[PDB]
Amino acid sequence: TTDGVYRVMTRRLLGSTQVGVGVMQEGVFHTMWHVTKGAALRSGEGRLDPYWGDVKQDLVSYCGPWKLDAAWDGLSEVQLLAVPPGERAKNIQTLPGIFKTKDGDIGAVALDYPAGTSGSPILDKCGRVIGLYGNGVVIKNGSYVSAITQGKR
Amino acid sequence: DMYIERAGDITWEKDAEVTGNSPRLDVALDESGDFSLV
Numbered sequence: 205t206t207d208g209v210y211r212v213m214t215r216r217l218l219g220s221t222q223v224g225v226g227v228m229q230e231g232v233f234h235t236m237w238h239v240t241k242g243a244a245l246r247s248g249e250g251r252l253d254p255y256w257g258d259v260k261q262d263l264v265s266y267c268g269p270w271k272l273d274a275a276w277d278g279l280s281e282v283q284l285l286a287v288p289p290g291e292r293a294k295n296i297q298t299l300p301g302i303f304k305t306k307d308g309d310i311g312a313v314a315l316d317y318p319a320g321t322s323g324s325p326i327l328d329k330c331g332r333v334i335g336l337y338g339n340g341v342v343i344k345n346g347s348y349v350s351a352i353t354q355g356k357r
Numbered sequence: 358d359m360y361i362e363r364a365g366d367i368t369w370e371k372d373a374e375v376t377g378n379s380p381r382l383d384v385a386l387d388e389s390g391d392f393s394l395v
C-alpha cells in the first residue's frame with residue numbers, strides 16, 4: 205500500500221491482462237471506475253475494498269476517501285506518467301487542452317495509449333497528481349483526447 | 358478478482374518527451390460518465 209502508481213491486473217481474460225492504472229496516496233488507491241467497476245483488488249495476501257465511487261466522474265477510491273486535490277493551473281505544461289500494459293512507465297510532457305462543457309471547462313491531454321492505460325496519473329511541475337487519464341473522446345483524425353479527471357477531497 | 362502491481366513513483370522527470378497538441382473542444386458529459394463531441 206506504498207504510495208506510487210500501480211497496474212490493475214486480472215487473470216480473468218486469456219491470462220495476465222492489465223485493465224488500467226491506479227495511484228496509491230496516503231493509503232488510498234485512486235483509479236477510474238470503468239477500470240474495476242468497483243471490484244475488490246488484491247494487494248498480495250491482502251485485499252482492498254472500494255470506499256467511494258461515482259460512475260459519472262468515472263472515479264473510485266479504495267480503503268478511504270479521495271485524497272487527490274491538486275488542480276491544473278490551466279497554463280503550465282504537465283506530464284502524463286503513462287503505464288501501458290507490458291511497458292515501463294514513461295513520463296510524457298504535454299500542454300493540456302480544454303474540454304468546453306456547460307458546467308465549465310476541464311483540462312484534456314491529447315495522448316493516445318492502449319486501453320489498459322486508463323488511470324495513469326497526470327502530474328504538475330511540483331509532482332502533485334492533478335487528475336487521472338482514460339476518459340475522453342475521439343477527435344476528427346481518429347485521435348484520442350482524455351480529460352484530466354480529478355475528484356473532490 | 359483483480360490485483361495491483363507497482364509501476365513506479367509519481368515524480369516529474371526533467372528528461373521527458375514533449376509531444377501531443379492542445380485541442381479546444383465542446384463536449385457533453387452524460388449521466389453514464391461518457392464524453393460526447395458537440
Ligand SMILES: N=C(N)N[C@@H]1CCCCNC(=O)[C@H](CCCCN)NC(=O)[C@@H](CCCCN)NC(=O)CNC(=O)CNC(=O)CNC1=O
Nearest residue numbers: 238317318319322338339340341346347348390391392393
Ligand atoms: N481509439 C483511440 N484513438 N484511443 C483509445 C485509447 C483509450 C485509452 C484508455 N481509455 C479507455 O479505454 C476508455 C474507457 C471508457 C471510458 C468512458 N466511459 N475508452 C474511451 O474513452 C472511448 C470513449 C468513446 C466514447 C465517446 N462518447 N474511446 C474508444 O473506445 C475508442 N477506441 C476504439 O474504438 C477501439 N479501442 C481501441 O483501439 C483501444 N483504445 C484506444 O485506442
